Design an enzyme around this catalytic site. Structure first.
Site, PDB file in Angstrom:
ATOM      1  N   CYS A 117      25.245  13.594 -79.475  1.00  0.00           N
ATOM      2  CA  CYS A 117      26.209  13.011 -78.538  1.00  0.00           C
ATOM      3  C   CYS A 117      26.081  11.488 -78.606  1.00  0.00           C
ATOM      4  O   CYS A 117      25.042  10.950 -78.205  1.00  0.00           O
ATOM      5  CB  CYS A 117      25.887  13.510 -77.150  1.00  0.00           C
ATOM      6  N   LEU A 118      27.107  10.893 -79.120  1.00  0.00           N
ATOM      7  CA  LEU A 118      27.206   9.424 -79.235  1.00  0.00           C
ATOM      8  C   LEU A 118      27.732   8.874 -77.903  1.00  0.00           C
ATOM      9  O   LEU A 118      28.196   9.655 -77.043  1.00  0.00           O
ATOM     10  CB  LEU A 118      28.090   9.066 -80.422  1.00  0.00           C
TER      11      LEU A 118
END
Length: 167
Positions: A117-118
């Protein structure tokens, strides 16, 4: 802006991609893959010259499934993680979802299957640049900065093991 200069500094010597074609686009996808591989190999050469050679990638023959390894150095210990992703049908508009499956369950900034998850700023940055960014940019702007937060946190917590000691 600080965000624009940060992106500029990371991407400036990475070859820009041109072809707006995804994995079902036949001769146009073959062309996009030539661009992807030339951008990747220049990024790896640049990394080697900066003592930061930190990943390897390979694909299947169709270029639709990518796999390899990344490395992270911390306090003179080297950690190695297997990485993989599929190319979305709407690539290069849609960024691939890089997974580090061995870390699944250990990281809050991660989805099932070890998909990283950026931060929420990544997708808009990608979207703004389509079709210029490719897999090298995904590595440099996405996975690299994520490792520099999440791997030190796992090391602080004491829940991953190094692969080898540094020299």
């Amino acid at each position: 802006s600080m965000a624009d200069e940060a992106t500029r500094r990371v991407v400036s010597e990475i070859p820009v991609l041109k072809t707006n074609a995804g994995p079902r686009d036949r001769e146009l996808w073959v062309q996009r893959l030539k661009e992807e591989y030339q951008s990747l190999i220049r990024y790896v050469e640049n990394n080697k010259n900066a003592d930061n050679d930190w990943f390897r990638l390979e694909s299947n023959k169709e270029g639709t499934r990518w796999f390899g390894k990344c490395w992270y150095i911390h306090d003179l210990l080297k950690y190695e993680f297997d990485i993989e992703f599929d190319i979305p049908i709407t690539y290069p508009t849609t960024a691939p979802e890089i997974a580090v499956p061995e870390l699944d369950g250990k990281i809050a900034k991660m989805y099932r299957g070890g998909k990283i998850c950026l931060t929420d700023h990544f997708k808009p940055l990608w979207a703004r640049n389509v079709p210029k960014f490719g897999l090298a940019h995904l590595m440099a702007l996405g996975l690299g900065p994520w490792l520099a937060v999440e791997i030190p946190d796992l090391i602080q917590k004491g829940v991953i093991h190094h692969k080898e000691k540094c020299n």
